[PDB]
Design a protein around this ligand. Structure first.
Ligand SMILES: CC[C@H](C)CN(C[C@@H](O)[C@H](Cc1ccccc1)NC(=O)O[C@H]1CO[C@H]2OCC[C@H]21)S(=O)(=O)c1ccc(N)cc1
Lengths: 99, 99
């Protein structure tokens, strides 16, 4: 599909057997999701943005379905105000910017 | 153009007669640029991102050319980690997400 940017590009995603709304975010290097109790091993990480840094948990090889498109890769989990799909998974679903 | 997302979508912009590099950021409602002198009146404002809130100067109805396309809109200037072009300007240049 084509998504215009008049409003926030929120789409439904499916992760860990759960449906969530997440932002398709070309400005985010890596996908970061609101705090959730994923199983598995993880590694601490810090990501920086407007306002400074937050601490997150980095999970590797996590399957996310984004609008029916499957993807698998790094998912970070931490106190973000919004679920964010970053470039690491956007490439995997064939997402481009166009103008 | 069509821009893939294996790398950061960085583009050259021109603002205040000056060239800069900025990030096309579909996750940003607003456009925030690093500290710079811009002519015209400005109002102090607060904006929040992943890490908290920062003080910025809001410039309204500013001319800014993004990878060859002209926009005239609101630009926030302050201690952002990188220059980010948000939806208020991405819409003006006809930018969409496609997959
Ligand atoms: C360094 C580039 C950019 C600032 C990074 N951010 C993504 C960005 O899209 C965030 C994503 C974001 C969206 C909404 C809340 C918090 C973060 N948007 C943002 O900060 O936009 C601000 C400017 O307009 C306003 O609208 C949204 C917040 C304001 S981020 O959230 O901090 C981020 C940094 C690293 C990773 N791996 C994932 C996300």
């Amino acid at each position: 599909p084509q998504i215009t940017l008049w409003k926030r590009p929120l789409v439904t995603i499916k992760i860990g057997g759960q449906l969530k709304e997440a932002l398709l975010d070309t400005g985010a290097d890596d996908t970061v999701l609101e705090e959730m109790n994923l199983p598995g091993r993880w590694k601490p990480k810090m990501i920086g943005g407007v306002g400074g840094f937050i601490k997150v948990r980095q999970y590797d090889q996590i399957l996310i379905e984004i609008c029916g498109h499957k993807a698998i890769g790094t998912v970070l989990v931490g106190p973000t105000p919004v679920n964010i799909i970053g470039r690491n998974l956007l490439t995997q679903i064939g997402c481009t910017l166009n103008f």
